[PDB]
């Protein structure tokens, strides 16, 4: 197994279609002892997380909560037993109000909405890193989830911007985590049909967008030289796991692209 005896925090599970859930599963299948966090809906997360091939402690973590954040390292230490440190952390957290995505015009997103988006989507990356870097072993690795925001695109809107922040934050976090012998990197994933993502494809965030969501998806698989299955979250998790392994030991401040190579091709 590729993650034997590595202790790993994983945030961002909410359904079994979450990228994070699939990250968790693969992690465990490679021998990792996990520590999970979730947000708001503890009663639901707990029951979802029982499906993972292995029981793992779940802790509450709103990243907008200065307390949850302050207490964090303590409660992680309590969950894994003192004298022990984390080998890897998974940021797979993201949020944007519907005023900043879909058919709803770019200009009409009020800053209170966007800001919160960025707080959760981008800032929390450093917040998590700040809380956990104290309890991280040399060799350790933080990873977060990204969607390629170099070129603008329809619908994705302010969420594109948050991701633009996030890649740049990532780079500063690699400066700090560096000091503890810890890598930080992002995984730029092609689209994944989460429950969330399947709603948008039934009417949720509008009508003009829901066609542009499917158009995006289809064009992804067309540009990807090896192809892209939005219904399979595994190759993204496997990539994540390889950044949590000891096998990319010279890679920090960076973005790995698990996208079937689609960003590398124009048509």
């Amino acid at each position: 197994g590729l993650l034997d005896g590595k202790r790993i925090l994983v945030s961002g599970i909410i359904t079994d279609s979450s990228i994070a859930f699939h990250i968790a599963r693969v992690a465990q299948e490679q021998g990792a002892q996990l520590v999970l966090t979730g947000f708001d809906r503890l009663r639901l997360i707990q029951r979802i997380t029982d499906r993972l091939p292995a029981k793992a402690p779940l802790l509450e973590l709103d990243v907008q909560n200065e307390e949850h954040l302050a207490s964090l390292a303590g409660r992680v230490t309590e969950a894994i037993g003192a004298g022990n440190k984390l080998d890897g952390v998974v940021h797979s957290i993201g949020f944007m109000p519907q005023t900043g995505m879909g058919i709803n015009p770019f200009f009409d997103a009020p800053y209170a909405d966007v800001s919160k988006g960025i707080h959760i989507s981008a800032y929390s990356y450093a917040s998590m890193a700040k809380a956990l870097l104290p309890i991280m072993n040399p060799g350790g690795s933080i990873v977060g989830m990204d969607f390629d925001p170099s070129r603008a695109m329809p619908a994705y809107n302010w969420m594109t911007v948050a991701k633009s922040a996030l890649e740049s934050v990532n780079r500063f976090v690699a400066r700090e985590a560096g000091k503890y012998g810890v890598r930080s990197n992002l995984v730029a994933a092609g689209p994944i049909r989460t429950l969330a993502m399947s709603a948008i494809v039934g009417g949720a965030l509008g009508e003009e967008a829901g066609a542009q969501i499917q158009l995006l998806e289809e064009g992804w698989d067309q540009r990807a030289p090896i192809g892209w299955n939005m219904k399979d979250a595994t190759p993204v998790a496997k990539t994540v796991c390889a950044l949590l392994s000891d096998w990319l030991p010279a890679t920090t401040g960076d973005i790995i692209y698990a996208d079937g190579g689609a960003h590398t091709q124009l048509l």
Copy 2:
């Protein structure tokens, strides 16, 4: 004259060292009729703007003010006389609290600061464009000011993040301005010794940073194949003008690099 009879909004003047000042001057020398906005210190700005080779209306513009924002278009219309439109707008606005720059550690910037920074430095770019696109002529052209945030650097901290956001916002603004026959572009400039930038090199934002500011600055000129004078904001202003001109007519959502070629060179 390169900007004959083009009417152009210019924001971001506060001293005669402001890049925006230098932009306005060169714009006028080129036959542009200007409209100026300032923030907070109107009594000071007004008396600074008398040094420009031509009197030009001065309006109040705090970009965190929903009112100032809503009323802008009309007060501009009033400023230049109805039946006339702007041909060009200059975002040259930016801010970040000293918890998010200089010696002060990256992780110790609380979110209320960082957000405020991004609101002024980045969100405002779309705020402004939303307010001004209605009153902009076909062939029109927006510009914002940029510092190259693709690599992380010491000191520049959360400002870098703000800048990565901005670049991304630019590209969305391009989508919108497009619909009006209007180009959107950024000028990523080398460092310019403003009053603020002389204070940082006198003690302001720490001691460790003040040598890294001078180490950044010296490295810029070294890496620049034509050289870089941080004392001279003219070439930066000239570049902005040429985006305001009619001569880069197929350029939008972009960043032009006024940095003496330093980002194209490693050593």
Copy 3:
């Protein structure tokens, strides 16, 4: 005029659909005294260049010809009269054998074809700079023609690579040119329907590719936030002029994009 009393070398006219032909025209309209070079078909070029709004000398220039290259500066000096130096040079040259574009498979282009393509398409760019830097005024500007090769694409094949070479060559030329107070830059244009580009859309380089050429071209205009007319070379020429002007004075080793903002958008 924008190029008043600037003397300027232009290469790569062969027809009045040549980007370089349009470059020439716009340059003269702006007041530039030109010096042209042509390849192989001098009798045809001469007669084509009689359509420009001004008579300008014509020189023979094969860029694979070491002699033509060694003698160049001298014949340029003789054309523009001794004691006078060029203020600007335009590379608008490029060539790739059909085994290295269109429907013909990527793997089947033998190296002697690929090499020649790079010789003309990429190496010459420095071969030209090497010849002409000696006789270039401080403040002077070189420019070459580019098509954005950062992502792969169907058909464009080994030309794509020749472009990647040329981008990188550009950045070194910037090092040398800088020693003379001379900028070097590239204009990454969208597709232009030259005579050569209309033949590919008639049947020239296959049948599969010709559909992908039209599909590329159509996607371009669709992606372009201000739009893209592949029948009008003008904006590309204007942009070139702006790099030959005094107005982008701190720009070197770079690529400006005259593509209607299409590379900044995914969909």
Copy 4:
């Protein structure tokens, strides 16, 4: 083992300081059955390759040799037993005449030298792919060796350009290899002190550059958030192996950076 019972071709061993050697060793420790190719000095490679923890067939491969190329897949077949297919191919081949590197002036490299360089350094990558794609299993992965050429630099010269070709060639190969279920990617490695690399630091390619090599190297480690050890080729090799594994299954046409994070940092 990470590469259990995977069959892998590895090119570019010439000394035990060769990255390729280090690539071979770690691949075997992971359970890969290797097939090696060498150039020109077969008697010396054979005896150097006896040091690898496992005996492996050695074949002759000059990539400038149309025959060697044509006969390749067959001889490989013959080396591993018919009915069997490669799961991996390592391009770790590079060359450039001293007229195109070091203190020797950029402009003085004649095109016969440059072209050879590109032939070996760049074109060959697709040559190899053309030869072996016929005999590669679905799931298979090609990898080549890169030095980040996005910004120019001193000494590195025409090799830089070759690399710029290679990254572009890479992307097209991904197109072709895609059709076989095969991934193509490059690894952008920091500097490795090979034997060749210690010569240059003794006197070989000049005096001015021999300081610029050591200046480059020192800056690399300075810039690297987790640091960079030019005397240890291991982490490079491990990264290579990770791309040869099944753990980056959605990654093609790309560059992974094994450079300690130095290209994501400015200072």
